[PDB]
Swiss-Prot record:
GO terms for cellular component: mitochondrial matrix; mitochondrion; nucleolus. The gene is MRM2. It is found in: Mitochondrion. It comes from the Eukaryota. The active site is at residue 144. Belongs to the class I-like SAM-binding methyltransferase superfamily. RNA methyltransferase RlmE family. Widely expressed, with highest expression in muscle, placenta, and heart. The keyword rRNA processing applies. S-adenosyl-L-methionine-dependent 2'-O-ribose methyltransferase that catalyzes the formation of 2'-O-methyluridine at position 1369 (Um1369) in the 16S mitochondrial large subunit ribosomal RNA (mtLSU rRNA), a universally conserved modification in the peptidyl transferase domain of the mtLSU rRNA. This activity may require prior 2'-O-methylguanosine modification at position 1370 (Gm1370) by MRM3. Essential for late-stage assembly of mtLSU required for efficient translation of mitochondrial DNA encoded proteins; methyltransferase activity is not required for this function. Keywords: Disease variant, Methyltransferase, Mitochondrion, Primary mitochondrial disease, rRNA processing, S-adenosyl-L-methionine, Transferase, Transit peptide. S-adenosyl-L-methionine binds at residues 33-36, 62, 79-80, 104. It comes from Homo sapiens (Human). Its main location: mitochondrion. This is rRNA methyltransferase 2, mitochondrial.
Length: 181
RNA sequence: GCUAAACCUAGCCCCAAACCCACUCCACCUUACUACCAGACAACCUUAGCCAAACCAUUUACCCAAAUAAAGUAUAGGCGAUAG
RNA sequence: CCUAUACCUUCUGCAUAAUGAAUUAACUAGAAAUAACUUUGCAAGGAGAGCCAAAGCUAAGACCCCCGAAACCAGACGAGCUACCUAAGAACAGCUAAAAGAGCACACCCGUCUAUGUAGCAAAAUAGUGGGAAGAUUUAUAGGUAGAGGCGACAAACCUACCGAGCCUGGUGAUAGCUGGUUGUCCAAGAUAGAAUCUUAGUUCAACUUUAAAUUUGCCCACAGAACCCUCUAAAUCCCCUUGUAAAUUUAACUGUUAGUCCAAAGAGGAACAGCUCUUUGGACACUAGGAAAAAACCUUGUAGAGAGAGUAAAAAAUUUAACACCCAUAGUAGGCCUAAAAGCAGCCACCAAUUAAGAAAGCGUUCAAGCUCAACACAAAAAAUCCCAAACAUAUAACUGAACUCCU
RNA sequence: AACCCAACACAGGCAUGCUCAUAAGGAAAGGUUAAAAAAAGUAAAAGGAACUCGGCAAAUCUUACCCCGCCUGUUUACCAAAAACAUCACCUCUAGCAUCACCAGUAUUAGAGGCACCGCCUGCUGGCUCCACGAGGGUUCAGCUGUCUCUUACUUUUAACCAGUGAAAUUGACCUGCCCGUGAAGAGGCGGGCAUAACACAGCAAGACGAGAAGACCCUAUGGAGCUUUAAUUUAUUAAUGCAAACAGAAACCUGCAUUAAAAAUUUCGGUUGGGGCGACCUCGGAGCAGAACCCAACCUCCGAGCAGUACAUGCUAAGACUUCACCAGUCAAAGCGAACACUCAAUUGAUCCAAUAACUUGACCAACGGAACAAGUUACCCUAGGGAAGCGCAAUCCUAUUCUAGAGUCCAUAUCAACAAUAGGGUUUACGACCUCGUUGGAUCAGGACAUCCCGAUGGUGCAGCCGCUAUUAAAGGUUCGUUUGUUCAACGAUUAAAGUCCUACGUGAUCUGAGUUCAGACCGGAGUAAUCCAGGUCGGUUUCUAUCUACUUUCAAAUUCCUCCCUGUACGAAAGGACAAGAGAAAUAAGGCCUACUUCACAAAGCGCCUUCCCCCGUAAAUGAUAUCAUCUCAACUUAGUAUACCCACCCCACCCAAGAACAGGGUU
């Protein structure tokens, strides 16, 4: 039914918090192999499955090649931190904006999770720096994070730029931000 | 050669016969064996079950007062184990 | 030196590393009658009333074990442990705080984690670390609720150190198609068709086996004889005079056995080569000995003792594998077709031909050519994990060795 | 009284008043030695979680979240203290009443329950938010430290020795060896070899499928029990009504009978298919099905049968036979009597009792079809009696190596690679629902071995210029890293390395250690079921113990491997780019064997983090001469060439003391 076990993680969050609905434009960072992309398309009706509900848009970005999926557009190879990808992302989305940002990016585990904590935080911050360009006001932001002390700095910056920030908990920690300023 | 080994009574069993014990003084139903104050308290009512029927559910011998014989016969019984 | 794999029990098969046994002494386990048989008495009658009798009747002799559940029921005994409750008592430093099912922290209660301990100090403890510690707190004393029940802030907790239903006595020598055991000597006969079953761990019947009795055929087997199909097709079998032999049927009285295992052979399981499972035939084993290394099932051999005799049966694996040509080739022609051109060799139609004698090319090499050789002319493998595994030996005439089979005293 | 309860002169239990460190009460060391292992502490260079399932323990005093529950409290006394129960608050249901409970109460009351405060949205009930709190389950900052890299020293107990006292489990007999093979399939006892004077003491834990249990795994019993229910059999019991009885003139009580509910009692789970879900099956006939007398292949494969029609002597009797391997049942039948002039059909069926009937006769998908008159689930709370639980040569399938020479590799079978197949070795699967699922392993320590070689080494081929690849032969002496979990349990990822090999060894190894699964006593989430309860599902928590009798073993006493830099050398090679061998020097690491001068932990010493030493070949191939086969040809032809050990150890007073010697013993010194 799904390409990766990470698909159930997004469904569980969506079930409780209701972050995906038809008509929403969703960006999937680190979309490979496509576990979150499949979940997003079904919820936002990106493939136009339900004629009575508005058709959303799903865009997947990852370094590795992603196999084609019905109702989803994928950009690969592309670096999320590369300004070139951000410009390409805007040209593809309707109205050059997105409604929901989903992030599952994870750098290679260098064998020291403490080092991997700050490295993953910087990647989230880099996405957060370019987030205003991609995200529209009042949107939803979800990122995959590894627990650590630097999560507070990410939490502090999200708290200033978002009305509400939630902590969602493998040893993964997910930050759910809604109502972008 | 040490540890040991050996013994013959104590008494008992089954019948017969015959119908058995129960006050020296003191204490003993209250916390028994505790000398010495007002209580009311009163006994009685089918046994069941294991077990047998190769389960189990009706049912399944239990001295009831003469040994023998009538006779395991007449009867009873998921008419069957068995009972008589 | 040579030979030899403890005993009991449970299974087809136990040296088995399956069960039981440290050992010694004592104790500990087949109880019964209808019939039948045998031995006496009497006899158409028998018996010391009854009862049987178409030779019976009376009496004697002679056959039927031990230990073990979890359970059920009845009547007693239990709340001095513990669960909850009743009556009337007691305990709770210090500090911060506030009139706190507050915080810190002794006494006290509890028992989170770790380690020690594991027949221990202890049938639940010690040490450290912990939770609570003015409260739904803890605790002393007396009383209460009792098993078809009590009690329970439900853990199916607790109710006197094994509570999904306490303990004790009695019914009780409960029952157990299950486990284990079942005691002196010697001889004899003795194994594998099935059917039914709340039945496949059992039992009944049959088959088989045993004993006694009566009787006359039994086994082996000459021809003859036993079906057509779906076309045809195996080893055989039944029947059965002779003959070799000595068994067979019937009657009487009962026990026990009844998935056998492996080997040879033919088959069965969706038309499945082995293996598995399951039938059929035969052998062996659960019966001795010898031989294949050790070996229940292969081969040899069975009827039982002693001998410091003898003759034989089966009975010891073989095999060691790859050379090779010598010489020569000029030419009617790049034989035509098609193809950029493909010529002897991209393909193809044709297969002639000079010279003593040479394919209108048999393999190679060129995009294609070139180059070459040949024809012709002369001249049959092996590799795994503790450590290879009898020692050895090509050449003195095949006899000898070898049993509990046979013979001999 | 030195005292009770715990089997003990028991490290446990034990109310209150004072003393709060004593004015009272006591003795941890029997003596010796300073081994190993084990226990408890103390100290530690540099690093500071790299250890590990987990920051368990220890040190230091240490932040910020997530999940669940509100909180304090309560529970499985003896493996679960929790997320479970209780809890204010809220909700539902029932009750109009006094003389032993509720209650000496009366709807703002009492009882039976759900749920778990509050706040918010919502239905008119459900869903969230949140204050604190927790020996709850995860994660993390910082600090901390022997958790580890990598262990070390010391003290005490233990230990060993001398003296006194003196157990237990255990045990068929033992005069108790190793390697292969074999075997009831894992041999100290059997076979073939080898080894072998006899004896203690101290260690070790490979074996004696080690000892004492328990748990688990299915299976069996016409063995139990608990629970649940629309399993069967009942309403005795209790309550409510009706009726009779009884009385008064209406009633009430009592009793009998009957009908309802309540509650309770008794009993049981039929076989077959590895288990379970879903299904099928059990009797009779036919075929595959035993080719020729009869019988005989279960399982399995496939088609049927549980009737119908025609008779109305389908009447009555009676020789002799067959028989589904027993019995029961079933089948054929001359003659005779009486009439006319043993029905077709492979199966087409059911015993006894009983019931009905004047009688003749009739009655069960008793289909579980030799049939009990009538009884289902569940147990992980389970109990009892038992029985089972490494190995199975030739077909299929997969892999490896050859064979075949098709086909790729510009040309080119054979530098590499390879189809259709075959031949050898290895592994796996296999008799029936052309259903679906489910039934021991890591790590620490120490390793033994195989070679089918990952690295180092030797040698051919190459589409090998040179470095560096590919391929093959040969080689097992030596080596084969440290970490993290997102793409988690040995799979990806990070940094490295000459390389991070494939395996076997009862996961090699649990009487050396530990984690998880198979799973269990508690508990929720999802699913199933009326319920009890269940699920290979998700999650949290959660007890095995062992004093070594025997075998084996306890200094092989001694030969070292690898990398990097430099040198040759920027040389050979190549157009450049790039870029070597061999020989030597130096340096580092690891391993093995030692040491204390310094350094460090520390001090008459031990020890590493310190220092010192380390020495043989390899057998694949490459060449000469030279016959069989007068050439040639490295020759399972005669022949030639290349690469075809030493060291250590070694004599024979002792009372007592000392020691760098040591558990005891022994040994060295005592001039
Ligand atoms: K009491
Ligand atoms: K004193
Ligand atoms: K807690
Ligand atoms: K051992
Ligand atoms: K039956
Ligand atoms: Mg019975
Ligand atoms: Mg029963
Ligand atoms: Mg042995
Ligand atoms: Mg024994
Ligand atoms: Mg004796
Ligand atoms: Mg009963
Ligand atoms: Mg009490
Ligand atoms: Mg009171
Ligand atoms: Mg106080
Ligand atoms: Mg308090
Ligand atoms: Mg406190
Ligand atoms: Mg309580
Ligand atoms: Mg419960
Ligand atoms: Mg329970
Ligand atoms: Mg008995
Ligand atoms: Mg005999
Ligand atoms: Mg039956
Ligand atoms: Mg004859
Ligand atoms: Mg003789
Ligand atoms: Mg020629
Ligand atoms: Mg002889
Ligand atoms: Mg003889
Ligand atoms: Mg001492
Ligand atoms: Mg030690
Ligand atoms: Mg340190
Ligand atoms: Mg830290
Ligand atoms: Mg690690
Ligand atoms: Mg780690
Ligand atoms: Mg971790
Ligand atoms: Mg700790
Ligand atoms: Mg609580
Ligand atoms: Mg509060
Ligand atoms: Mg407990
Ligand atoms: Mg308690
Ligand atoms: Mg606990
Ligand atoms: Mg609760
Ligand atoms: Mg608490
Ligand atoms: Mg003893
Ligand atoms: Mg010996
Ligand atoms: Mg062996
Ligand atoms: Mg010893
Ligand atoms: Mg049975
Ligand atoms: Mg039951
Ligand atoms: Mg017959
Ligand atoms: Mg039957
Ligand atoms: Mg029959
Ligand atoms: Mg449970
Ligand atoms: Mg090397
Ligand atoms: Mg080799
Ligand atoms: Mg072991
Ligand atoms: Mg815990
Ligand atoms: Mg030991
Ligand atoms: Mg060099
Ligand atoms: Mg020559
Ligand atoms: Mg030559």
């Amino acid at each position: 039914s799904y390409r990766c076990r990470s698909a159930f993680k997004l469904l569980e969050v969506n079930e409780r918090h209701q972050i995906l609905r038809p008509g929403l434009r969703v960006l999937d960072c680190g979309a490979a192999p496509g576990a979150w992309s499949q979940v997003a398309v079904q919820k936002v009706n990106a493939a136009g499955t339900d004629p009575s509900s508005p058709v959303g848009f799903v865009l997947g970005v990852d370094l590795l090649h992603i196999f084609p999926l019905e109702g989803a557009t994928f950009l690969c190879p592309a670096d999320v931190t590369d300004p070139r990808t951000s410009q390409r992302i805007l040209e593809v989305l309707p109205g050059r904006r997105a409604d929901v940002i989903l992030s599952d990016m994870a750098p290679n585990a260098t064998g020291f999770r403490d080092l991997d904590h700050d490295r993953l935080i910087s990647l989230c911050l880099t996405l957060l720096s370019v987030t205003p360009d991609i995200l529209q006001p009042g949107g939803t932001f979800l990122c995959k994070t590894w627990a650590g002390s630097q999560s507070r700095r990410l939490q502090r910056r999200l708290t200033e730029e978002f009305q509400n920030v939630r902590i969602i908990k493998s040893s993964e920690v997910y930050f759910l931000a809604t109502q972008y300023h």
